[PDB]
Amino acid sequence: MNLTELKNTPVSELITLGENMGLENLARMRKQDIIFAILKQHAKSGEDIFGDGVLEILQDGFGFLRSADSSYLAGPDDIYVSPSQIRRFNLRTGDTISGKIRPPKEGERYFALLKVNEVNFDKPENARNKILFENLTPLHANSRLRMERGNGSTEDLTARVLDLASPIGRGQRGLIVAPPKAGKTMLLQNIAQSIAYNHPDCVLMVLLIDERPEEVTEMQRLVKGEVVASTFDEPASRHVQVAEMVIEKAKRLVEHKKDVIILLDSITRLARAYNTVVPASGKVLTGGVDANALHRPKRFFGAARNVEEGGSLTIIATALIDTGSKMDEVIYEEFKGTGNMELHLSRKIAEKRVFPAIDYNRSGTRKEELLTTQEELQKMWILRKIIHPMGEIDAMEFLINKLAMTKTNDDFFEMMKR
Amino acid sequence: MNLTELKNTPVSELITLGENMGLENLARMRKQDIIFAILKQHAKSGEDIFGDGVLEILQDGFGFLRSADSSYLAGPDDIYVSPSQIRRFNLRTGDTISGKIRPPKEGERYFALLKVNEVNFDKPENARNKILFENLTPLHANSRLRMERGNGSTEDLTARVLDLASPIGRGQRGLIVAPPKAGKTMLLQNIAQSIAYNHPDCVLMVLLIDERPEEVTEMQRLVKGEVVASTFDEPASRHVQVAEMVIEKAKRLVEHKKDVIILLDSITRLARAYNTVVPASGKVLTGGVDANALHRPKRFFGAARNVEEGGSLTIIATALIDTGSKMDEVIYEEFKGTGNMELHLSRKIAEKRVFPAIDYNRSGTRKEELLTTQEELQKMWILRKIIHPMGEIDAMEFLINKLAMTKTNDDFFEMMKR
Ligand SMILES: Nc1ncnc2c1ncn2[C@@H]1O[C@H](COP(=O)(O)OP(=O)(O)O)[C@@H](O)[C@H]1O
Ligand SMILES: Nc1ncnc2c1ncn2[C@@H]1O[C@H](COP(=O)(O)OP(=O)(O)O)[C@@H](O)[C@H]1O
Ligand SMILES: [Mg+2]
Ligand SMILES: [Mg+2]
Numbered sequence: 001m002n003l004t005e006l007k008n009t010p011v012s013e014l015i016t017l018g019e020n021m022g023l024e025n026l027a028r029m030r031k032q033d034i035i036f037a038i039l040k041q042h043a044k045s046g047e048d049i050f051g052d053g054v055l056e057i058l059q060d061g062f063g064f065l066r067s068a069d070s071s072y073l074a075g076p077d078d079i080y081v082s083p084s085q086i087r088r089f090n091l092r093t094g095d096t097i098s099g100k101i102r103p104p105k106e107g108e109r110y111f112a113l114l115k116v117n118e119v120n121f122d123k124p125e126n127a128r129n130k131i132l133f134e135n136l137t138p139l140h141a142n143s144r145l146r147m148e149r150g151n152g153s154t155e156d157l158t159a160r161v162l163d164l165a166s167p168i169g170r171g172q173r174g175l176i177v178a179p180p181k182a183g184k185t186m187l188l189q190n191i192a193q194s195i196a197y198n199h200p201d202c203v204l205m206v207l208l209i210d211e212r213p214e215e216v217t218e219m220q221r222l223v224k225g226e227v228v229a230s231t232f233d234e235p236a237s238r239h240v241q242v243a244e245m246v247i248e249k250a251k252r253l254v255e256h257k258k259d260v261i262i263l264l265d266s267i268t269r270l271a272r273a274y275n276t277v278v279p280a281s282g283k284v285l286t287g288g289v290d291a292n293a294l295h296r297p298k299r300f301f302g303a304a305r306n307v308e309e310g311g312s313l314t315i316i317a318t319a320l321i322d323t324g325s326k327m328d329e330v331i332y333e334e335f336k337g338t339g340n341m342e343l344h345l346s347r348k349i350a351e352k353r354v355f356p357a358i359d360y361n362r363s364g365t366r367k368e369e370l371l372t373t374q375e376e377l378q379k380m381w382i383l384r385k386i387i388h389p390m391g392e393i394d395a396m397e398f399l400i401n402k403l404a405m406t407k408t409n410d411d412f413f414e415m416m417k418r
Numbered sequence: 419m420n421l422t423e424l425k426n427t428p429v430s431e432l433i434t435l436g437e438n439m440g441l442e443n444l445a446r447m448r449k450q451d452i453i454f455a456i457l458k459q460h461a462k463s464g465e466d467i468f469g470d471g472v473l474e475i476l477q478d479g480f481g482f483l484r485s486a487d488s489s490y491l492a493g494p495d496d497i498y499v500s501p502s503q504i505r506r507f508n509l510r511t512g513d514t515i516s517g518k519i520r521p522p523k524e525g526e527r528y529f530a531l532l533k534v535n536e537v538n539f540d541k542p543e544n545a546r547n548k549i550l551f552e553n554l555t556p557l558h559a560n561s562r563l564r565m566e567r568g569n570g571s572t573e574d575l576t577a578r579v580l581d582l583a584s585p586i587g588r589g590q591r592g593l594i595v596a597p598p599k600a601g602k603t604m605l606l607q608n609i610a611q612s613i614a615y616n617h618p619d620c621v622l623m624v625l626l627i628d629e630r631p632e633e634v635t636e637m638q639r640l641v642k643g644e645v646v647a648s649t650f651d652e653p654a655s656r657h658v659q660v661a662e663m664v665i666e667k668a669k670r671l672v673e674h675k676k677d678v679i680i681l682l683d684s685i686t687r688l689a690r691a692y693n694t695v696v697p698a699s700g701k702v703l704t705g706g707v708d709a710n711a712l713h714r715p716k717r718f719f720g721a722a723r724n725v726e727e728g729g730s731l732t733i734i735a736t737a738l739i740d741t742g743s744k745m746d747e748v749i750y751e752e753f754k755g756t757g758n759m760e761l762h763l764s765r766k767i768a769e770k771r772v773f774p775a776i777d778y779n780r781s782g783t784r785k786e787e788l789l790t791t792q793e794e795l796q797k798m799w800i801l802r803k804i805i806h807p808m809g810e811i812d813a814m815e816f817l818i819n820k821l822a823m824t825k826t827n828d829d830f831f832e833m834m835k836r
Contacts, residue, residue: 011553027547028508180755181784212591212758213556213723232756233720235713276709280701288704325751351806353799 001042003051003077003101007035007069014038032075039077039111043103051079051111052098052118054249055091056241064110065097071228072245073238080110089119090128094248096120120256131309133251138305141169141340144371145202145261145314147194148409155190157403158356162191164383164399164409165358166341166365167372170202170259171306173338174316174365175267178345182357184318185215187345188263189222191316195261196224202259207246209239210269229265239273240296247300250313257310264317271297271331287326294334301338322347341365349396359392360399379413386416419460421469421519424453425487425495432456450493457495457529461521469497469529470516470536472667473509474659480504483515483531489646490663491656498528507534507542512666514538538674549727551669556723559587559758560788563620563679563732565612570825576608576774578821578830579814582801583781584761587789588620588677589724591756592734593685596763600775602736603633605763606681607640609734613679614642620732621671621678625664627657628687647683657691658714665718668731675728682735689715689749705744712752719756740765759783767811778805778813797831804834 006014011031018026018038026034043049053065054072063086065079066072079101091097098118101111119127145168147159168174178184188206195204204225208216216229230242250260264270271294278293285291304315319335320328342363349357364384369377387395406412424432429449436444436456444452461467471483472490481504483497484490497519499509509515517534537545563586565577586592596602606624613622622643626634634647648660668678682688689712696711703709722733737753738746760781767775787795805813824830 011549015549025508025546027549028510029550031553181782210755212756213720214558214758217555217557231720233713233717236709276701276703323754325754 001049003035003039003049003053003067003079006038007067007077032070032077036076040103043111048100048114049103050099051101051113052096053079054245055081055093055095055097056245057086057091057093061086063091063093065113066245068226068228071230072242076110078110080108080112082112085113085116089116089124091119092248092252094245094250094252096249096252120252122256127256130255133255133303136255136305136307136309139171139308140367140370141172141306141312141314142370143170143312145169145195146198147191149194149197150408152407155193157400158187158190159194160403160409160412161356161358161399162187162194162343164380165360165363166343167368168314168316168341168365169306169371171304171312171314172316172340172365173301173304174314174341174343175335175339176316176318176343176345177321177332178318179322179347179350180320182345182347182350183355184345187356188265188318189219192223192225192263199259202261203253204261204263205246205250206263206265207243208265209243209273211265236273236276239270240277243270243273243300247303251303254307254311254313257307259312259314261314262304262316264315266320267297267301267317267335268320268328268331270300271335272327275327285330287330289327289330289334294331298335298338301335340367346392346396349393352393354393354396354400356396358396360387360395361392376410376413379417383413383416419465419467421453421457421467421495421497422471422485422487424456425485448493450488450495454494454529458521461529467519467521467529468517469519469531470514471497472663473499473504473511473513473515474663475504475509475511481509481511482528484663486644486646489648490660494527496528497531498526499531503531503534507537508546509537510666510670512663512668512670513545514667514670538670540674545674548673551673551721554673554723554725554727557589557726558785558788559589559724559730559732561588561724561730562789563587563590563613564616565609566827567612567615568826572822573608573611575818575821576605577612578827579774579776579778579817580609580761581827582798582817583776583778584759584783585786585789586732586734586759586783587724588732589722589730590732590734590759590783591719591722592732592759592761592783593753593757594734594736594761594763595739595750596736597740597765597768598738600763600765600768601773602763603683605774606683606734606736607637610641610643610681619677621668621676622681623664623668623678624681624683625661626683627661627691629683654691654694657688658695661688661691661718665721669721672725672729672731677730677732679732680722680734682733684738685715685719685735685753686738686746686749688718689753690745693745703748705748707745707748712749716753716756719753758785764810764814767814770811772811772814772818774814776814777810778817779810797835801831801834 014034015026022041023037053067055063056066057063061083063081097116099116100114102114104111147162149156149159206223206227208229210232211229213231220227230239250262253260274296275289275293281290281292283290304313306312319332321332344359344362345357346359432452433444439459441455471485473481474484475481479501481499515534516536518532519529520532522528565580567574624641624645626647628650629647631649638645648657671678692714693707693711699708699710722731724730737750739750762777762780763775764777821830
């Protein structure tokens, strides 16, 4: 069979298939080992076996084909690719390769690619001449992504508040700032649903760093897209490698005239992982953070842009404030003006149980004239004028009150205008 | 005879039994040595011996059946299991194995397992088909573990405050943050009694790390369950290995659709022990800690989850703050967002002898709507709105005063809803 559907099957069916297929015991070891054993047993028969995965290039030169189901985790069933194939077809880390794999011979442990018949969802002879990501000319965002749903529910209400506070376009560097227990996970979930329903063409890749396992499973079940996460019990190098693989896959996809949206769970956690994994350079700032250590997360965050040739990369990351650890504060301070927009969540609104707890006065994008029309954006300015001279919690309560009895954004605008 | 009942008799009775059996000089030797001598004498008598214990696999390949009465301490009375037996039944560390044992022969110094007839309180055939713990999908806790006894005693007051402050469900990852001499040991004792009374079906395990011997004896006498401890006069390797044994036994129990609960006296002490044991990786964070050193305690804490297939693993661990040590501070900093519920004990409330010294405004759980009913959630919300403005010590004094005048929490809510 094909490795993808074999891996996607739950464990019970895998065990039953292995036990009625010839193997003797599968219940008491990991899913990756069961997959490897089933593949090895089916491979000795001689039937061709297919497989696909994202390419990760090691420092030696050989590469591996990790899978999204296992969250890009190194395992016994990873496909091995020699540098000969990398020379034959120009391949970099993050490329998606699909083809047929060969059984592992003596002296080798992992499977190997027989021949590749898909690179980045098209022919390799057509994909090895594509211009690279950094050579593309960045531009300001000009195509707005609408989170308006129209169903009229509460998630629609918070999506409408999101649209009012800061419009979202393709290729921006959006940043969310939020205290703990302020509702940022639900905000990200609602953004994911809005993106999935409104713009099915865009590629959505939710990335969670240093997350709890239950949150990972809930996000995987809720989101109609690629979700990759690394729980907190895993080492920092695991977080770093997951982030690198995600960003490389996003760059490879955007080089093919595709729109990619990345919903990073915590830029703070990624920065902490990078600081942990980056060797000490002898320079220690406040909170024990090195500038060269912060270079990598800044490089990850700055890849968001709009491509003149085609496609875009919209990175929306979240940051943690007033947690109590100085490292988060210094990360926020060195991440103040990096993004072209910001949205602030208020703890005071959260404890009042008024959701979403968006601080309208402090949140807001810039250069939004390129995103929306003229009259709607003028309505946005006059709403800003109305909201400005009054308290943020009262402003948020007023916004929920005036968005609840109406139905969509333009209806609220015309009701408020008169 | 049976070994696990021989290990539970007092030392004086053991000495009398060995003396009337025909043994000498048993008074001035350790309890394990007396047990081994009595076992050898009764074995050379000719009769059969039954023994049980939790399996621990050594790096060489063979394993030992440790006993929880000695808190899994290596001793002469441990049962040796050969790699052949670990191979015929695929066994992992933490498996509870019960069966007949045989006397040692020449060249070997341990009793050996003869014929295993119980694995994890099940026949050996069925225990081979249990799915590994890592393959199960974690979920949010949705089955409430009610703490209130309802007998009207003052010891129940703490439990009642718990039910108002931070509800606990099956599969929680609770964290208790308390200063020294704030009442965390009595809080854990109250939780253990409430669990043993309200939910007899759950498996209760109390794990004490770096403890004092008198506290160990007190907890063993009080707690109706399994108590294993490693006192402060033992090497860090002992703390580490006791923690691994407990967590592996818990995972093996959970794999059999059992819901188990672990009460960790100090995650800080466990992190200390792991930092001592784990070799350095060249990078040392503030206070003298290593990231890979802290990786294992994070795995221990993150093992807690609610299993979709059935069963759960609740872990409630206490963390130390304001102890004057930077290592504890950094450990708590790295353990902040991991748990899904936190309970804060305040030193100031303890100074004025107000118990339980719970910081109500800081304590709480995540996704508490799953644990409680709708009306109960509304009552908790209005209570939190009432208590929020006032200071922590005033809040707890007022809450205790209000709670002392009722019998159950329903009556308290009805009195508040006047
Ligand atoms: N849009 C919303 N509508 C209703 N409740 C919300 C909303 N956003 C957050 N909450 C509340 O916040 C809690 C979860 O917060 P969460 O999203 O986990 O914040 P964080 O991810 O920052 O910890 C839930 O109990 C929920 O009641
Ligand atoms: N619920 C309670 N009721 C009465 N006294 C308490 C309570 N909890 C703690 N105390 C007092 O606090 C003292 C120390 O508490 P302890 O159990 O030693 O906590 P810790 O282990 O944090 O030091 C005890 O002597 C006890 O008198
Ligand atoms: Mg969250
Ligand atoms: Mg104590």
